[PDB]
Each structure stands twice: as C-alpha cells, then as structure tokens.
C-alpha cells in the first residue's frame, strides 16, 4: 500500500540515511511494494540462514549428518557468542549449532559451520547455483560487518534476499523435512523482540532473522501471515545513521506497524 511508503520516507529523514524495502508475495512471487530494490547494503547476521540452508542440502545428499559433534577450544571464541562459550569440554552437534546461529546470533557457531562447508566462497558459489547472482559473502565474523561506504564485499540487495528465501522455503531445492527444520529454527528466535514482533497481532505467525553491525547497520528478514501459516516475505535494511541503537529499532517496529494496518 502506498501509505507505508510514506513511513519509510519518514524513516530515511528520521534517521539522516537509506533505508532499502521489499513486500512480496509468497505463493506466486509477485512483488507488492518496494523503495531502493536494488540498491547494495550489508547483510550482517541474515547470512546465517542462507549458510544453515547450504547445510541442509548436503545433509540430503548424504555428505553431512545432523548428529555429528564438533569439537572447538577457547583459541576459536572471538566476540559475542552466547551458546558456543559454554561448551568448551564436549562440543555441540551440527544441529545445536544451526539452533544457536539462528535463534540467538552467535557468532563462533557461524564461523565453525562456514570451515566444514568450505568457507566464504563455497557459500557464494551455492547461491550462484540456485539462481542468484548478486548476494556473495567474502569474510569470516567479526570482519564481514565492517560497513565500508561503497564495498560490495558481504552484500545483497532487498529483492535478491527476498527471492532467494522465498526459493529456499518453498522450492523443490531442499526436501519438505529439511525445509520444515529451517521454518522452525526461525520461528524460535529469541533475540528480535523489539522490531517487527513488536507490532504482530495475536494468533499471526513469524519466522524471521535480524543484523546489526558499524557505521549504523541494522536490518531483519521474515516470513509472516494470519492465522498461523505464512503468506509474505518483507525485507528491510538500513546503513549510514548515527542514531543510537533504540532508535533505529523504533523505526523498524514502524514501518511494521504500517504494514500490518494496511494489510
């Protein structure tokens, strides 16, 4: 609806920077609005469902199983990994480290998975495959949220990101079991309370992920509809503001708000 573009007009001047949107429509892939589609911006941590969406393909394939433990020492931690730091002396199978990246941002969770599929080049040459030709990731946590002016380096755009989980959710690309087990390890997520959950009404369903890193960045992917089952994937990225932290977050809850009103 036209009227939710008047938010993120107000957004941008509220926050002194850009701010990149897209609604689209799960069943069919139309696209229903969108401001700055194709415009650049850093992904942060919405790489780490596409990196558990590589995962699960070669555990289809028979080359990775969901059981098998990894094992890690404290050379490995580097900042912000909540999960990863408590279980120095047994490890964590593939499946609680898919669970700790998703659901709580952890940062040496992703790192970890990222060496047993091949690293940075491994994951853009899967995305490649699948159809898309302009997210790519290029460095390992905590360096990709960097957020240098004009790098491409850990990019994507708002209708690229937003094709390529409509394809990894419903596709045939990976089985429904699989498909099912990335649903439900963003649905579980516990560390997005402030932005577009804040504005969800009772009985709606989300499954989502958000970022944030320098230089202002903050963003969040979802999938969302009444009546507990999904019908639309909404993506919005930001970059470049010196507000603080709670203010980019109530700009968020906003838009969100307008998106629902208007629904």
Request: charge should be negative.
């Amino acid at each position: 609806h036209p009227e939710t573009l008047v938010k993120v007009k107000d957004a941008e001047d509220q926050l002194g920077a850009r701010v990149g949107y897209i609604e689209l429509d799960l069943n069919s892939g139309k696209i229903l609005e969108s401001f700055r589609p194709e415009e650049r911006f850093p992904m942060m941590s919405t790489f780490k469902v596409l990196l558990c969406g590589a995962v699960l393909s070669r555990i289809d394939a028979g080359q990775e199983q969901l059981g098998r433990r990894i094992h890690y020492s404290q050379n490995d931690l580097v900042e912000y990994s909540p999960v990863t730091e408590k279980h120095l002396t047994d490890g964590m199978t593939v499946r609680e480290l898919c669970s700790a990246a998703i659901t709580m941002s952890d940062n040496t969770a992703a790192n970890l998975l990222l060496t047993t599929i091949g690293g940075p080049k491994e994951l853009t040459a899967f995305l490649h495959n699948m159809g898309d030709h302009v997210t790519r990731l290029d460095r390992w946590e905590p360096e990709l949220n960097e957020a240098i002016p004009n790098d491409e380096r850990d990019t994507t755009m708002p209708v690229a990101m937003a094709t390529t989980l409509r394809k990894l959710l419903t596709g045939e690309l990976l089985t429904l079991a699989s498909r099912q087990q990335l649903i439900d390890w963003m649905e579980a997520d516990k560390v997005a309370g402030p932005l577009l959950r804040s504005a969800l009404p009772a009985g709606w369903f989300i499954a989502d992920k958000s970022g944030a890193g320098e230089r202002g960045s903050r963003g969040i992917i979802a999938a969302l509809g009444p009546d507990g089952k999904p019908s639309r994937i909404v993506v919005i990225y930001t970059t470049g503001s010196q507000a603080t932290m709670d203010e980019r977050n109530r700009q968020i809850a906003e838009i969100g708000a307008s998106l629902i009103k208007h629904w």
